[PDB]
Design a protein around this ligand. Structure first.
Ligand SMILES: C/C=C/C(=O)SCCNC(=O)CCNC(=O)[C@@H](O)C(C)(C)COP(=O)(O)OP(=O)(O)OC[C@H]1O[C@@H](n2cnc3c(N)ncnc32)[C@H](O)[C@@H]1OP(=O)(O)O
Ligand SMILES: [Zn+2]
Ligand SMILES: [Zn+2]
Ligand SMILES: [Zn+2]
Ligand SMILES: [Zn+2]
Length: 550
């Protein structure tokens, strides 16, 4: 419907082109088509297959060759990328190009908005971090070697003449040499009325939620219409006793604070299933085969998430998975909870209450399981490894990751509040707790899925040639600050408790059975949590998936 008259485009866009022209000397290298012979650059057309320059763009603009402004934008960016491709990162033309692109970004955005568009930005997704086979990492722009887009090797790892994969043998000549410089553009959706192309993420159009098609805000307002209601919301996910309890605690806290521009928080439990952790081969040979320790321990895993409405749209800002070992579970795991992992995306409003809200969620959770008859909570204060994510794929680059001391103090501050509220009786590091329990053997340590202690015990038994317990106190002392043991129910009352009965039903949801599936989904579908807009999109997609798979 909306056809842009060539004078309309010229009038609107020419000032953005002049802005580049008037950059001296930066503009000069880009004003005329590259003559490779005259400049003395022979291989230019071996690399650059679609040459572009300011004159060519000016001409297309003067002669009405563009039907819509993104075509102008694409040519501008082609010119820039041609120069960034051909010239060295350290060169003159490269840095000049970079300067022009900055001028362009600033110029183009408000112009495109004047023409009825979401924005004028050039948007591309973050490059994924590439592993090796033999646990190292390949960074962005570093040359590397790959086979079947599956087996990749860092350049140093490669030069040492046939590779083993899995176990078949592949000559080095069969590998691709390439740079990790590939970035996927953001996708557009077309307004079904005016025909304008908008960033799908800018407008948050999801085809399942609005199957009749995308209609831009401009077109809606002209006829005083509004979008059909999004029924795939966080609020409409099924309620649980636990979720309700946590969200009530949070919102009651927020109401007491009465900070300006506070929003309601929604907490939902999205997975609950029964699982078992098996004792690993070292500990099994040592204690299971002689009948001193159970071969495996049953637990219930749960996943829960907190959401806030920001700018009218759902935003998932906190996630946590827990392991719950009930009253039927054998010692040493009986009546214990362990936090598998928690994660957050730092967009909560108001900022000044963010930490407080996370603490309320954790304190609430401890309070809840205490009420059910769980006696003891367990936390391993372990920051994610460099450039890894616990739950949310691709964090904002300006969200800092706490180092261990800061994270330890954060847990201590939470627990101190829990103690002052008479929820937590007390808490101790693992070394002090073992001392208090008069622990003598490794078989007496709680044994959790994915935890530090099962792995270090394997290593210890093998290193010592058969002892599980020799250096155990020394190992606990050495790592003590990182391991919290939290007494919810103390003393004689902990010995005569009734069975634990959880009133909430099981909740099958394969997507949220541990962290891996949602990380995989997010990676495969470009669901990043790296900016407010991308997190809002990713939340919207996550919620559709949660609503439709169940
Ligand atoms: C076995 C499994 C165990 C676990 O999962 S334990 C939990 C581990 N999880 C994670 O760490 C997941 C990712 N982290 C989170 O989501 C974590 O934030 C989190 C989920 C705590 C939440 O942390 P908070 O936002 O409540 O607090 P932080 O310590 O992250 O940040 C507070 C503060 O410290 C600053 N900070 C944080 N790190 C640093 C550094 N490094 N240097 C300097 N300053 C720093 C940060 O910028 C902030 O500054 P201001 O708001 O501007 O005052
Ligand atoms: Zn946009
Ligand atoms: Zn390597
Ligand atoms: Zn429209
Ligand atoms: Zn404030």
């Amino acid at each position: 419907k909306k056809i842009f008259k060539p004078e309309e485009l010229r009038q609107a866009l020419m000032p953005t082109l002049e802005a580049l022209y008037r950059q001296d000397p930066e503009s000069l290298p880009f004003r005329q088509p590259v003559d490779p012979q005259l400049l003395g650059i022979p291989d230019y057309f071996d690399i650059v297959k679609s040459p572009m320059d300011l004159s060519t763009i000016k001409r297309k603009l003067d002669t009405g060759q563009y039907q819509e402004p993104w075509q102008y934008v694409d040519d501008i960016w082609l010119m820039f990328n041609n120069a960034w491709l051909y010239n060295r990162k350290t060169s003159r033309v490269y840095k000049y190009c970079s300067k022009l692109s900055e001028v362009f970004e600033q110029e183009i955005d408000p112009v495109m908005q004047s023409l009825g568009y979401c924005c004028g930005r050039k948007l591309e997704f973050s490059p994924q971090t590439l592993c090796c086979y033999g646990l190292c990492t390949i960074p962005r722009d570093a040359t590397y070697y790959s086979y079947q887009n599956r087996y990749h090797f860092c350049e140093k790892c490669f030069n040492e003449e046939s590779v083993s994969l899995g176990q078949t043998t592949i000559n080095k000549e069969q590998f691709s040499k390439r740079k990790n410089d590939t970035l996927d553009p953001e996708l557009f959706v077309e307004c079904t009325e005016c025909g304008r192309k908008m960033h799908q993420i800018c407008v948050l159009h999801h085809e399942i939620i609005w199957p009749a098609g995308f209609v831009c805000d401009g077109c809606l307002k002209k006829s005083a219409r509004t979008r059909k209601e999004n029924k795939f919301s966080a609020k409409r996910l099924p309620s649980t006793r636990l979720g309700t309890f946590l969200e009530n605690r949070v919102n009651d806290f927020l109401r007491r604070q009465n900070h300006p521009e506070s929003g309601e928080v929604t907490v939902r439990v999205v997975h609950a299933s029964d699982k078992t952790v098996e004792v690993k081969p070292g500990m099994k040979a040592r204690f299971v085969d002689s009948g001193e320790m159970a071969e495996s321990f049953p637990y219930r895993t749960k996943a829960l998430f907190a959401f806030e409405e920001i700018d009218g749209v759902d935003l998932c800002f906190f996630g946590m998975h827990v392991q719950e070992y009930g009253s039927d579970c054998p010692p040493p795991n009986q009546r214990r909870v362990y936090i598998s992992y928690l994660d957050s995306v730092h967009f909560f409003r108001p900022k000044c209450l963010r930490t407080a809200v996370y603490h309320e969620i954790l304190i609430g959770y401890l309070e809840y399981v205490k009420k059910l008859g769980y006696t003891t909570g367990h936390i391993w204060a372990c920051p994610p490894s460099e450039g890894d994510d616990y739950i949310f794929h691709c964090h904002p680059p300006d969200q800092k990751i706490p180092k261990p001391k800061r994270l330890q103090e954060w847990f201590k501050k939470m627990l101190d509040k829990a103690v002052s509220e008479r929820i937590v009786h007390d808490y101790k590091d693992i070394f002090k707790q073992a001392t208090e329990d008069r622990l003598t053997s490794a078989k007496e340590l709680p044994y959790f899925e994915g935890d530090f202690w099962p792995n270090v015990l394997e290593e210890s038994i093998k290193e010592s040639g058969g002892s599980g317990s020799q250096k155990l106190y020394a190992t606990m002392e050495k790592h003590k600050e990182v391991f919290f043991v939290i007494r919810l129910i103390a003393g004689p009352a902990a010995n005569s408790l009734p069975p634990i009965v959880d009133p909430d039903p099981l909740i099958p949801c394969d997507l949220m059975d541990g962290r891996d599936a949602f990380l995989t989904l997010a990676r495969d579908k470009h669901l990043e949590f790296s900016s407010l807009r991308r997190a809002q999109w990713s939340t919207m997609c996550m919620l559709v998936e949660l609503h439709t798979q169940s």
